[PDB]
Point group: C5
Chain length 335, copies 5
Amino acid sequence: ITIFTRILDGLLDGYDNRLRPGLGERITQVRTDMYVNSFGPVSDTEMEYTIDIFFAQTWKDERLRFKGPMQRLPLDNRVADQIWTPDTFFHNDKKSFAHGMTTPNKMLRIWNDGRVLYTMRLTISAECPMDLEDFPMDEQNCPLKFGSYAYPNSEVVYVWTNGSTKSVVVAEDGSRLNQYHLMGQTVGTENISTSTGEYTIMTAHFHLKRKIGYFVIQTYLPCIMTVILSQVSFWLNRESVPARTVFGVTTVLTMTTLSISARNSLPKVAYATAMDWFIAVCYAFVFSALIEFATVNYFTKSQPARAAKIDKMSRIVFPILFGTFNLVYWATYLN
Amino acid sequence: ITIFTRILDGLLDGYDNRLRPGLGERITQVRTDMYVNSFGPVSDTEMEYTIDIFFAQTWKDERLRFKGPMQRLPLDNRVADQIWTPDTFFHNDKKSFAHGMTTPNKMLRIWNDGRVLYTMRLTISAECPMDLEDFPMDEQNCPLKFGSYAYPNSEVVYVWTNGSTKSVVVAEDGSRLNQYHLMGQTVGTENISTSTGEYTIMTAHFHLKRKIGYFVIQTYLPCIMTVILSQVSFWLNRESVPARTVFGVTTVLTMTTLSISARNSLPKVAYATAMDWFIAVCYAFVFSALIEFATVNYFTKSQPARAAKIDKMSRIVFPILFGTFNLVYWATYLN
Amino acid sequence: ITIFTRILDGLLDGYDNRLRPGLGERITQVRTDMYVNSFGPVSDTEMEYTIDIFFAQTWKDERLRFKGPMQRLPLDNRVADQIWTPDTFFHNDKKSFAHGMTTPNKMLRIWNDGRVLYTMRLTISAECPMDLEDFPMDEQNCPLKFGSYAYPNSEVVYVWTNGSTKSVVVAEDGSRLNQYHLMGQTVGTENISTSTGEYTIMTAHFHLKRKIGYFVIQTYLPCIMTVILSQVSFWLNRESVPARTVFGVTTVLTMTTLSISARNSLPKVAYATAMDWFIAVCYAFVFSALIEFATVNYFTKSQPARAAKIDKMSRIVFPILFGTFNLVYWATYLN
Amino acid sequence: ITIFTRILDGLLDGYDNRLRPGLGERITQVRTDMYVNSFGPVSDTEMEYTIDIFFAQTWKDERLRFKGPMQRLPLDNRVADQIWTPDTFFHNDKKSFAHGMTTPNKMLRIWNDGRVLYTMRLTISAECPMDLEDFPMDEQNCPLKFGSYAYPNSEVVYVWTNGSTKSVVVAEDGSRLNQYHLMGQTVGTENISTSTGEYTIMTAHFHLKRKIGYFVIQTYLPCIMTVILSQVSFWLNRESVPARTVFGVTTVLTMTTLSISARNSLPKVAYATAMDWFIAVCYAFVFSALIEFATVNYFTKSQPARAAKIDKMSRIVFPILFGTFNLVYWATYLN
Amino acid sequence: ITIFTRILDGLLDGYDNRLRPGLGERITQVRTDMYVNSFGPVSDTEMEYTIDIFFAQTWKDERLRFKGPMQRLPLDNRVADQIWTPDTFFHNDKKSFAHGMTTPNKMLRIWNDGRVLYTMRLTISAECPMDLEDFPMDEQNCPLKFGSYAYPNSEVVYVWTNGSTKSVVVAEDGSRLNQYHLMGQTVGTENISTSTGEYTIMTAHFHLKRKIGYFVIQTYLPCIMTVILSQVSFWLNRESVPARTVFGVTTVLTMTTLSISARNSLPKVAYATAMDWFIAVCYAFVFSALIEFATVNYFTKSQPARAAKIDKMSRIVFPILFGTFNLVYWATYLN
Ligand SMILES: CC(=O)[C@H]1CC[C@H]2[C@@H]3CC[C@@H]4C[C@H](O)CC[C@]4(C)[C@H]3CC[C@]12C
Ligand SMILES: CC(=O)[C@H]1CC[C@H]2[C@@H]3CC[C@@H]4C[C@H](O)CC[C@]4(C)[C@H]3CC[C@]12C
Ligand SMILES: CC(=O)[C@H]1CC[C@H]2[C@@H]3CC[C@@H]4C[C@H](O)CC[C@]4(C)[C@H]3CC[C@]12C
Ligand SMILES: CC(=O)[C@H]1CC[C@H]2[C@@H]3CC[C@@H]4C[C@H](O)CC[C@]4(C)[C@H]3CC[C@]12C
Ligand SMILES: CC(=O)[C@H]1CC[C@H]2[C@@H]3CC[C@@H]4C[C@H](O)CC[C@]4(C)[C@H]3CC[C@]12C
Ligand SMILES: CCOC(=O)c1ncn2c1CN(C)C(=O)c1cc(F)ccc1-2
Ligand SMILES: CCOC(=O)c1ncn2c1CN(C)C(=O)c1cc(F)ccc1-2
Ligand SMILES: CCOC(=O)c1ncn2c1CN(C)C(=O)c1cc(F)ccc1-2
Ligand SMILES: CCOC(=O)c1ncn2c1CN(C)C(=O)c1cc(F)ccc1-2
Ligand SMILES: CCOC(=O)c1ncn2c1CN(C)C(=O)c1cc(F)ccc1-2
Ligand SMILES: *[C@@H]1O[C@H](CO)[C@@H](O)[C@H](O)[C@H]1NC(C)=O
Ligand SMILES: *[C@@H]1O[C@H](CO)[C@@H](O)[C@H](O)[C@H]1NC(C)=O
Ligand SMILES: *[C@@H]1O[C@H](CO)[C@@H](O)[C@H](O)[C@H]1NC(C)=O
Ligand SMILES: *[C@@H]1O[C@H](CO)[C@@H](O)[C@H](O)[C@H]1NC(C)=O
Ligand SMILES: *[C@@H]1O[C@H](CO)[C@@H](O)[C@H](O)[C@H]1NC(C)=O
Ligand SMILES: *[C@@H]1O[C@H](CO)[C@@H](O)[C@H](O)[C@H]1NC(C)=O
């Protein structure tokens, strides 16, 4: 153990962590790996998502080159703080933190040739814009961008691990989401020209397809039952004005109540959503069934034969219409 | 007191906490104990649970081997920071923190032979997936996985305490939960092969049985009374179209109102829940009682004798049906 | 000022804060005082309560014994870190923090004989289980336990201040609670045998009696008015089937609406609450008034005289029953 | 610049920040100034308020007395930490924090004679009990108490700035509140005898007048319309039992619905609020209009002429009563 | 690399970060740049907005002027802490924090001539008062003011960038908001006289125009449908007192239900909002249609010809009126 105490002391004696490795000589290339331990909750209201990853980075540093019996130096964060590390930051991040129990989860390993490995565990809430036009039969793509904050392209460059280690890995246990399904992952690299030089930023996209199960139970199913409720009126006595009247208005109150409740749980966007149309049409089918009787009753005095054909015809026309509406609605958005 | 100041200074003189004990010589074996002071709130929506534990770890470090009058060295965190400790982290953790008042709750004890005792207090929110198909007659198993972050199996190994201290202990005060019951605990050890070596991870499962009391009061009971409400209609005058009509529709509005409220308090999962079916069937029993009258009124003019048997039988079939339905529902899920 | 700088420097010169005072000689006895500046919000849902206290502790450290003109040394937190202090932790704590503005509120005072006074201000959210069977005519007792984390009975012992300084003091300004009333305070001491030795834990119980004012306004009163609403039906025309029918069902919808709203605000426990019964009985009084008419209507054809006695007697039986129900309900739980 | 480096080094050379200025000689007098940058949200439910202030303190420290070309030493927080400062804490505080971006906002300035200026920016959530008996025609007064935590009157004394600089200043931008109006400010000084000596505490009261606008829109106005709704019944056909019956019960359901929602937004106190009475009376005016008809219908069979005067009289008596009630209600509380 | 280690050591050798550059000779001028990476959520209730910016500042410090092969010194935060920096704080800030993952996002660059570049990433929640009289056809302007906390105009001055870097830049991805649209940005400088000298404060205004889409879907449309619902009553049988009565009251109950939910999502201000009027008028149109029938029914017995003209005229007057109402409402506020 005393052998390694002098090796560490020798490497760090006179080591200037303020300067990057290969300053004025080479561009420090960093091979970045990643393992998604858990895909945190996604929010279609706040347009963000949380993710728990093991973010690994390896680069070249000649100052740490040593020769000894061991081929690797297993070390903790106590050394990761004393040496230089890339100040990798996440561009689209909202807030982030590195897990600290028991000690700040930072693993450092130094090989003879100077190869460094500096990985940590991060829970980060990043941005994810969404176009909820097809919501809840929706598909969104949440990116994760990260690069160096202080080092332009001339000073530092990032690249993904190619071949040995998979670029992005995701655990099946953590990927489980109540309302989304993780389709896959995509990685890429790009250069960006900013007012403080051109930086290389590394993107990692997580494709998501929304699960409609919760919404069939909450909104679609009760709406369907409430338009069928309105269409019961056609089979009741046409001459019983109070019965047909109170039935038509109470069902509108029912649909009006149902649309009020469904509104609270839906994203607060400023455009029409695929569900917003389903609720709209259903309200029209409930409102229409009421107007249907208002016409039936208006003609009862002088044109009762006409008011009878309207009601009897409405018994088949209404369900056939709402039936075909669903045939088109689901056939359109489920594609 | 002056004796112990030189012993501590002597041990820490030249002590390199950056290196694990026995590097290149022995494997640091850590005996892990745990005491659940409180089982924090469990969340079936966020699929997580909070837990408050005293997490103890003991290993052997020859560098701390000393000779003196005392057999043990009672010390605080002021020494725990100066020595080496295993960087044990919890794999399924979402967020964790160690209690700090008055001082960081870390207890250190060093015996003559060099065995160390390093325990701390942790409140941690860990992951716990759930299959809420039988909710609220549910059973879940929440795990707690923890291992070393930087040291694979070759460098460090974990084992549960055998004999003196029980692996996992639970306090009678804290395990109390409003909606859950802690059945028991299970401990285990397993090896995992990762891209940074093979680590030993220690699992601790907490079995949970849900308490249906809250849900019988909130949803089951009012639904049952509201279908019984619908079945009152069969005993009223069939020829009074407004009475039977307004009664049939108002109860649907009532059942529709009841189902809207129950939906908010239930988990926002995307599959059918055991309660979701009970609400569904009840809505069907209310909707049927209405359709039952719609037929009675439809046949009342030309087929009054036929419409009479429908109403009278509905007086017994409906309650007998809903009665037998409950017999099957509860008998099925309570098993 | 130059006199005290050498006294302080002399005391701290060679002072080892890692070791407790009187190690291997005497047991460090700590007299703990407490002043509740404010009793934070109590939660009957999360089973928790917040409290803001000035937590004072005094012991004797021979190393700090000095001789000088001043009898005591007024000092800030800048010295509290340099000396030894008991690592007092709160056993039932959930989350705690020490006020830091302007500077960390820690007061240190050192007397000639070496007796120390070390107090701080703490806001702590501690556990408080509740048996809400009589809720909201309830009484709860919230404890506050604190002891040493690293020093067993043999090494450190706690005792309450008796006589000179009051053990626990509470300001009437902070004791104000919207839904609770602070009856009093009780203090005690006990020994607990743990796997790391036997420790002494100090308990402080705060007795609470719940205030029913908010609930009479929110729930009891509207329920009473809504069952009296149901009993208006007996005075209406028996031959008007729609009038009596819509009145009976709409009031059930009203009571069903009223009970749904009261449900969200009430604690989410899994057992029957004293109020849950009051809402239950009231719903029964509204549901019965409806069933009462269904029977009246069922007998109207062949037994109208019997259907008349039912309605007319119900005008007095119902209010006398609900009247006497309140007489019994309130008389039982208010005791 | 090298001149000031030697002056600062000279002043801080041998400076003991653990000791207060004038220890064992004089009482350190601190003139405290304050500037309310913003008056954070006020909460009548949690009985607290947030406030953002620039908290200034000035005293004399003879050790910092220097002679040089400059008359004052403009310094940042880097020096404020190195010297002694009063450990001023806010007694009624619940949680506070000092702004840190870019650097901890602490301004230090040292004059020749040794007078120091040490100001900081603080956002603090302080306590503010309220007597909401006249709510929402309300007026509250929130205090702000602060003194030294470790230094009694004998060692430190606080006094407000007088003359040139005003004790408390408030910006018109921050004083804007959605539901409150800031009447003015009051400052005062007092001594308090505590178990750790007698301290001097400085109070700053902020007088508040509540804005009734939000509640007229939410609660008062719809209630007024809903009692006028109930009084429509008197003008409808008295012999139409279903019409008058369904109208009477639906308005009660409407008023019962309205009172449930207004309740959620109101403070959860345990006494009657000025609004609680307005809602109560309105419910009584809706409930009475229903009983009015129940009487009309009860007398219609045998005493129809009397049932006519009741209905016709109620057309004038009811609105005149609700009219005079409002005349008295507003005249009482708005005074 | 060893060349730069002596240069840095040479520059920092004897460097006093407590003193500003050019003290007692020149005014430290700081050119401030800004890049809005994301425009965080805006709150019309809390009157605040969150923003994520790259806040850059550049000044000249002669002490850091060096001669070497490189023209600039790429450095991290490890040096930014060791040198002097302007203590720039944001005046209207409520809560701010600088991103810390991986390392504190502070970029430092030192040119030969002594020019420094000190930029950081900040997420800050600043104040933004609003006049929501025209809400939701609204326009608001949220400012962002920042200056030096300890250095008045005489010692430090702030200025906007000269043309190299644009003063305020906004990212195309992050500026997207659900309910607002970012029109543009305006920058300015002003002097303010405070009790601690006169400071220069830098303003940055972000103009916002509200999106009416969400409110058309949530409130306007259902209100439109519910007043049209009320106007159906004129076409139904005038002599059917129950039919017209239950329809009139239920639509009021429906509109009354609609107004409470609309109130929940709207800002809790104490003045009348453009929507508050639209909801009010719609309630008047539903209530009026009810009073319309009460008049028709009151005249039905003795003045049926008058009760016929009233009802028939109402079929056109009501929709024509509500039609023109929208024409004026939308035409006025949409301008
Ligand atoms: C002529 C007739 O059979 C009546 C019965 C119900 C009436 C409708 C009710 C809803 C609308 C009310 C509005 O005031 C005028 C247009 C609308 C659409 C009315 C047009 C005329 C209708 C259809
Ligand atoms: C002929 C008859 O007794 C009528 C009375 C109520 C009617 C039902 C009401 C609900 C549905 C409405 C839909 O438009 C057609 C199918 C459904 C299921 C109707 C079929 C015909 C029924 C059963
Ligand atoms: C025969 C008679 O006076 C009728 C009127 C209302 C009816 C009750 C309505 C509620 C229940 C409905 C259920 O379907 C059968 C039992 C229950 C309890 C009925 C039994 C028979 C009653 C009491
Ligand atoms: C005789 C008469 O005009 C009836 C019509 C409505 C009835 C009241 C309804 C509400 C109450 C119901 C209770 O069961 C008895 C007392 C109460 C207050 C009744 C007393 C008698 C009244 C006033
Ligand atoms: C005579 C007549 O056509 C009646 C029918 C509905 C009545 C109105 C109902 C609402 C109000 C009730 C109040 O008690 C008196 C004024 C108000 C405004 C009444 C005035 C008289 C009206 C308009
Ligand atoms: C794919 C790159 O992987 C990392 O960067 C990494 N960094 C730390 N660890 C890993 C591997 N990994 C996915 C773990 O879960 C894990 C499990 C352990 F028991 C100990 C360490 C790690
Ligand atoms: C316009 C003012 O900009 C800055 O002062 C600034 N400060 C840091 N950075 C920038 C440039 N900028 C707009 C970035 O996005 C960026 C991107 C990177 F990958 C690394 C650093 C920065
Ligand atoms: C069984 C696991 O034991 C620990 O890991 C442990 N660590 C600290 N403590 C314990 C023992 N234990 C269960 C306590 O509750 C306790 C009680 C005290 F008053 C002081 C210290 C502890
Ligand atoms: C019960 C032990 O109390 C303390 O140890 C204590 N610590 C701080 N303070 C006290 C006394 N006390 C009850 C106060 O309220 C108070 C009032 C002040 F103005 C200044 C300091 C304190
Ligand atoms: C009245 C008490 O005032 C202070 O003690 C104070 N402390 C800090 N500052 C002030 C003056 N003041 C009212 C400011 O707004 C201000 C404005 C600045 F740009 C920089 C510093 C300050
Ligand atoms: C992008 O950046 C990388 C950084 O190494 C560089 O090699 C490549 O030539 C650049 N290409 C473009 C188009 O910017
Ligand atoms: C797992 O690892 C431990 C390391 O101590 C070893 O003793 C055990 O045999 C291993 N078991 C398996 C199944 O790999
Ligand atoms: C606690 O145990 C100690 C011995 O360690 C004993 O002296 C003391 O009296 C005990 N206290 C109580 C309350 O039993
Ligand atoms: C409070 O105490 C101070 C001494 O520190 C004294 O000067 C002052 O007069 C006292 N106030 C009152 C009201 O007695
Ligand atoms: C313009 O501003 C930049 C800020 O970095 C500065 O370096 C440069 O010297 C300035 N030049 C002029 C002409 O203002
Ligand atoms: C701001 O103050 C400085 C102080 O010298 C002055 O030169 C400048 O003209 C002032 N600018 C404004 C807009 O007041």
